[PDB]
């Protein structure tokens, strides 16, 4: 932990998490801006985290250019420092800055293929990352943007266990943890994913729903409601119910009118009701979608 | 299906190659340790085993614990004293990295008859996390099983059992398997798993995956089948204990294989 907080100075808070707060700080030895992540301890008195013990570990394995980089760790008895590389801003931001411009289509298409570079590397690692949304995908001025947010992950074995239910943010989330199956795997990151794809081209949310039931609904409403031969074992699922609505699939090029038919290939792949047909991010790498990928610096 | 993530599984298996090897405890530390033995050792981990199955905790769990105690071991010279502080805060870690739902410090105070104070159980905790650089996704016999389990045909659940239970042997005793890999003792326990109740041989299926063949294993299979044999004598019971719950298919009341022709 080369790392000593002095030869840090702070420039201004950017975020909070439940278990502290993020600065971006000032390397001042080498010049380097970092986000320094402050972990509060015994603030439960129960010891460090689980949830940054998690995210350190999982973190310092993975290397790669699309996964915001853990620089070091600082271990004082009362405080866990978290260093990290810094990045100008989140996609949330960016989608909001970018109100009434939309996003450029080449600018969409490089975001989502590096975001699936990151993802494939995090489930090569056997890393679920369990919370992919925009306000956890970090952009900066030369073009990149990067999984952040590991504070939900988990290193999975293969095949998976049951592992935590209360995962992913709701408009974010599978239908299969909607559905309480008892097991839930890579596929649920590719979800969110493909609901981030449909929300860099609208600028909003593509499932807003404001309760589990009407999450579902909202998702149904769109996909149509699975049945057995979409989505075989449906039926059987803890929470799936056979009151529940049986509205039609709309046709897919109402869901994202401007998408071209490449781009509405993949999101539907994405959003394929059974895991086990849903793409995963290595086979989406080559998806005639991004045939002409490039990777333009963000336009604001 | 995703849930044996296909399009993964093979470069699960080659990271899990690699990081074994980084994870490994130095092979020969209870020589450098002064005042503790591979003896206490085993009462430790037989104690876990205990600890686990009152706190109904995965097995994943317990067996990253004694990674982290043969880690921190290899590096951190300790007194018989401390040896429970060392396994009691390394439970406590494999737990929050692990389980869905950990038990409390409180609860890991208390399994230790107020031997230490919460405070010693969270400073050793700090320690550890020092001494193993917050590393803790370490490899284990269980990830390399759940894999090659899946290159049953059919399954079996006495086969996946009894090599869940022969693996967990192995964590009592450091000599003769802090010598031996995870993924080896995991492919020694399912051969042996697997000849036991099926009459059946390591698959050639497996050899294209690991590379291993009943050659390489035969050193391992040896000494894991004495530990099979021996296992009714052994000090340590806790693991046959547990081996006898129909959870795990009563597979500790198999009889062993009196000979193995490898
Ligand atoms: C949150 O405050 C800091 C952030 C950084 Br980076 C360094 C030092 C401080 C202490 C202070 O001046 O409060
Ligand atoms: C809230 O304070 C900080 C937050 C960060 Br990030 C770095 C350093 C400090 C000073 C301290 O440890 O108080
Ligand atoms: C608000 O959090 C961050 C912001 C930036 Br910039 C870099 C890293 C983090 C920590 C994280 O990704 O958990
Ligand atoms: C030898 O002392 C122990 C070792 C282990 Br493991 C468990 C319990 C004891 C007695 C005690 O902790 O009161
Ligand atoms: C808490 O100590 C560390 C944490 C991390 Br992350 C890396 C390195 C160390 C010291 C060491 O390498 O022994
Ligand atoms: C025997 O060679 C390999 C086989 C597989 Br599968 C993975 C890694 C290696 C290198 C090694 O572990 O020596």
New binding site residues.
């Given amino acids: 932990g080369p790392g000593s907080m002095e030869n840090f100075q702070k420039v201004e808070k ?2 909070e ?1 439940t278990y502290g707060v ?1 600065y971006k700080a000032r390397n001042k030895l080498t010049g380097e801006v970092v ?1 320094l ?1 402050k972990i509060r301890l015994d603030t439960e008195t129960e010891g460090v985290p689980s949830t940054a013990i998690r ?1 350190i570990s999982l973190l310092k394995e993975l290397n790669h250019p699309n996964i ?1 980089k853990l620089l070091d760790v600082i271990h004082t008895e009362n405080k866990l420092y ?1 260093v ?4 100008h801003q989140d996609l949330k931001k960016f989608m909001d800055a970018s109100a009434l411009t939309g996003i450029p289509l080449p600018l969409i298409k490089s975001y989502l293929f590096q975001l699936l570079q990151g993802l494939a590397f995090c489930h090569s690692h056997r890393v679920l990352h369990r919370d992919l949304k925009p306000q ?1 995908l ?1 952009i900066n001025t030369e073009g990149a943007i990067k999984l ?4 939900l992950a988990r290193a999975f074995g293969v095949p998976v266990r049951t592992y935590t239910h209360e995962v992913v943010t709701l408009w974010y989330r599978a239908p299969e943890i909607l559905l309480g199956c008892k097991y839930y795997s890579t596929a649920v990151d590719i979800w969110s994913l493909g609901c981030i794809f449909a929300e860099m081209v609208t600028r909003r949310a593509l499932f807003p729903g404001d309760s589990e039931i009407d999450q579902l609904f909202r998702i149904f409403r769109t996909l149509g409601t699975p049945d057995e031969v979409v989505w075989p074992g449906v039926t059987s699922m803890p929470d799936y119910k056979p009151s529940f609505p049986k509205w039609a699939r709309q046709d897919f090029s109402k869901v994202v009118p401007p998408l071209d038919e490449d781009g509405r290939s993949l999101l539907s792949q994405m959003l394929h009701y059974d895991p086990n047909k849903r793409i995963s991010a290595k086979a989406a790498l080559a998806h005639p979608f991004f045939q002409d990928v490039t990777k333009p610096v963000p336009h604001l | 299906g995703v849930n044996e993530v296909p399009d993964y599984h093979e470069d699960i298996h080659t990271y899990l190659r690699e990081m074994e090897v980084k994870c490994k405890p130095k092979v020969g530390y209870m020589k450098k340790q002064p005042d503790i033995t591979n003896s206490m050792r085993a009462i430790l981990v037989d104690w876990l085993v205990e600890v686990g199955e009152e706190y109904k905790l995965q097995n994943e769990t317990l067996h990253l614990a004694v990674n982290y105690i043969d880690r921190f071991l290899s590096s951190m010279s300790v007194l018989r004293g401390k040896l429970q502080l060392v396994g009691t805060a390394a439970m406590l870690l494999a737990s929050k990295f692990e389980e869905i739902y950990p038990p409390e410090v409180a609860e890991f105070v208390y399994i230790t008859d107020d031997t230490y104070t919460k405070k010693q159980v969270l400073r050793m905790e700090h320690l550890v996390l020092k001494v193993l650089a917050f590393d803790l996704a370490a490899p284990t016999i269980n990830q390399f099983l759940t894999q090659y389990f899946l290159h049953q045909q059919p399954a079996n659940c006495k086969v996946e059992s009894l090599a869940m239970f022969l693996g967990e042997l192995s964590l009592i005793d450091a000599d003769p398997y802090l010598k031996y890999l995870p993924s080896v003792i995991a492919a020694a326990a399912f051969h042996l798993a697997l000849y036991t109740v099926t009459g059946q041989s390591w698959p050639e299926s497996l050899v294209q995956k690991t590379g291993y063949t009943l050659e390489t294993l035969k050193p391992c299979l040896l000494d894991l089948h004495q530990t099979y044999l021996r296992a009714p004598q052994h000090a340590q019971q806790s693991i046959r204990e547990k081996y006898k719950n129909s959870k795990y298919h009563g597979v500790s009341l198999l009889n062993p294989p009196e000979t193995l022709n490898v």
Avoid: H, Q, Y
């Fill in positions: 950017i975020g998490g993020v986000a992540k995210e915001v978290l990290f590389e810094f990045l956890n970090l952040a947010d590991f504070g």
